[PDB]
Design a protein around this ligand. Structure first.
Ligand code: CAA
Ligand code: CAA
Lengths: 375, 376
């Protein structure tokens, strides 16, 4: 049958910074208090993000020990890699233990692993580090996805669907783990998109167990993965470019990204839902990657969504920031937890079918349809 | 049916450097002539490689323009990335055009794209650049495999098999493209493995079209992908470690790597071929990632292969050097092309089943079983 999500677990770094305090923290730790107008602008940017708090692996102490990370485009990749090459797999293990505990079956039954991040690279990769950390089978089939960015929560679901459905008995562990230290930069008047980026992202990891043919007495389906699309939005290549250089992961973020999503989003919805005979956008539940608050707003406008349709997406953005590839998988967890807490008839807000969107460089949209599980 | 390889295309950069001249070239362009004894030892290593020439996208002019590439651990990542971020996808496009031309069906029918490299990263990635360059469908489903390493020619086949077999009518384009500029380094006494590494690797890209349910009137099966296995070799973690730093892609490569493969290879063969009822190693054809000449020798000795079983593997090592993730895919093309030129009865040297091995960090071994196709 369809690849089905059987367990979800999430984790974050312990250090939390409130968004209402972030501009002061940031201008202080980067020694940039002399840029008063830019501080004022960043205060405005933070207020607009609709983010309440963010967990960050990057500490004040690490920055003090590695100052170069605060000086715009000074060499600092080695310090970044020193954090994220062990950080990323360790955070991913924390989420994966929770998923494995919820699922409840022996870890020995995990046949495939998909490890996804956008922070650092190394050989052996973070996937190897995860198997050693978790004690998974040395013969587990691995899919190491590096430098993946914000649509890749859709990518992992698209990949896991084919692995689970083509391999009888298989059980796939998905881990997305993101640490934003790779793209932290001090303020610079010529790079306002880079400044904006300092308010957007937080750290986190999500882990899922996915398989077809659930043993219903002991496994608990949460959602089935119905179909996956991936497409490049015409004439949006300039929207987002990020290069891995001696100074860290750089940022080129166009201010019209939200409008580029608005122009294309009804066609991605229609392409996913017309095959199912669904044309009423409010008859389905939505999990929308919160690249920024304005992206959510444009999706709600262009799909003509009731005011609460994107609650679960806005809730994740508020409590954690944009978690890059793990973000939409925190939203799947939010949707199913809230549905159970409210006593809905289904895991997808009492509705039968839902649509998940990931948005990343290219511009790429990943559109995944999920079917709820009747409860 | 089984995922089947339907077309193969390769490409290399134009600049070719003979291995018999590499020691002199290397020590000259890295301005290290005063390291006479290291120079002498580099001549011995190059002689041992069993490599005749390599194609390299890295030029002398580029090195003179970016001198920190030749200074051991000076900051040089940005120069490296400025080369490989455009070079990898362009070189992969040249291989892909050839594969698609062999195939002959419309490029609009490619539904999935697997792009794999071990040289540089960028966002949007090399997969996106390739779609633009080739004019694939904007909706092609992509799998961007970065920092993959020498076992990843087995990886791409493992992944394409599941995508082709689970998606009716799908046709997967696989591209592996490697440019070794990301790991070039000047000589240094305290890093002899990094010196050995300047002699092993060459540049190249391979592209394959894979699909299940071949339309036989117009598509030509080459090999079917029977089974795939990936497994970490016990206690070999420190054998290979490569870090991407301000100075480029570093190297830690242990001298006993060939024996670590030898200790474990018979087991890899047995797990793949026992379920097929096969026990005679000389009854199958073999495609062995030539991580170095000593790896081939150990695999040959430990499996007791006859004298020419590894010919095709030794042949691409000789003509191209170790091409990292694309290396085994050039070997697959060498096997089927040599088999048809000699009039063998099958595309796998006249034999029915074959085993492909990739070896990379972890240590990881990827083992893929291929079934050959009858010629005539
Ligand atoms: C790693 C990945 O794979 C790739 C990723 O980076 S994808 C990142 C995707 N997310 C974003 O692109 C979308 C962010 N956009 C938004 O959500 C909103 O624009 C926002 C929360 C950033 C601001 O909210 P808003 O309603 O647009 O406010 P608005 O007043 O217009 O703008 C905030 C301030 O930032 C500016 N700003 C916003 N986006 C900008 C950009 N990309 N570059 C330059 N400055 C920009 C405005 O110009 C404005 O400044 P002033 O107060 O100095 O006049
Ligand atoms: C990118 C990735 O994904 C990861 C990769 O890099 S995987 C790379 C895998 N490839 C290999 O490990 C190479 C395997 N080794 C080889 O095939 C052979 O050792 C070789 C062709 C390099 C030399 O052949 P050989 O028969 O072993 O010759 P041998 O005389 O013992 O050795 C060559 C010289 O290099 C030295 N050498 C070989 N490997 C060494 C290493 N890893 N570290 C240090 N020095 C080494 C020897 O000590 C010897 O030197 P002297 O003449 O100064 O005494």
């Amino acid at each position: 049958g369809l690849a089905t999500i059987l367990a979800i677990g999430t984790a974050t770094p312990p250090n939390c910074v409130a968004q209402a305090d972030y501009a002061d923290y940031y201008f202080r730790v980067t020694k940039s208090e002399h840029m008063v107008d830019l501080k004022e602008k960043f205060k405005r940017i933070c207020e607009k993000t609709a983010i309440k708090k963010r967990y960050l692996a990057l500490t004040e102490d690490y920055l003090q020990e590695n100052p170069t990370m605060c000086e715009f485009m000074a060499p600092s990749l080695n310090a970044r890699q020193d954090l994220v090459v062990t950080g990323v797999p360790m955070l991913g293990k924390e989420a994966a233990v929770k998923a494995i505990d919820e699922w409840g079956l022996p870890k020995s039954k995990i046949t495939h692993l998909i490890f996804c991040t956008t922070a650092g690279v190394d050989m052996p990769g973070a996937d190897y580090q995860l198997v050693k950390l978790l004690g998974l089978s040395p013969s587990v089939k691995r899919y190491m996805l590096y430098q993946q960015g914000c649509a890749a929560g859709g990518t992992v679901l698209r990949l896991a669907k084919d692995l689970a459905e083509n391999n009888k008995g298989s059980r796939v562990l998905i881990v997305c783990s993101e640490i934003t230290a790779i793209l932290f930069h001090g303020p610079n008047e010529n790079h306002l998109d880079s400044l904006v980026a300092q308010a957007l992202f937080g750290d986190g990891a999500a882990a899922l167990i996915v398989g077809s043919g659930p043993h219903l007495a002991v496994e608990r389906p949460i959602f089935e993965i119905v179909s996956t699309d991936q497409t490049i939005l015409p004439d949006t290549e300039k929207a987002m470019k990020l290069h891995l250089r001696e100074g860290g992961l750089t940022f080129q973020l166009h201010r019209d990204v939200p409008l580029m999503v608005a122009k294309n989003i009804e066609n991605a919805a229609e392409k996913a839902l017309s095959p199912l005979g669904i044309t009423d956008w409010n008859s389905v539940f939505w999990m929308v990657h919160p690249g920024g608050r304005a992206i959510l707003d444009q999706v709600e406008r262009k799909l003509n969504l009731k005011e609460d349709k994107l609650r679960a997406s806005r809730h994740v953005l508020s409590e954690y920031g944009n978690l890059i590839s793990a973000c939409v998988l925190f939203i799947i967890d939010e949707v199913r937890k809230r549905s159970m807490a409210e006593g809905k008839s289904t895991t997808g807000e009492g509705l039968d079918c839902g649509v998940l969107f990931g948005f990343g460089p290219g511009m790429t949209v990943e559109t995944v349809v999920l079917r709820s599980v009747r409860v």
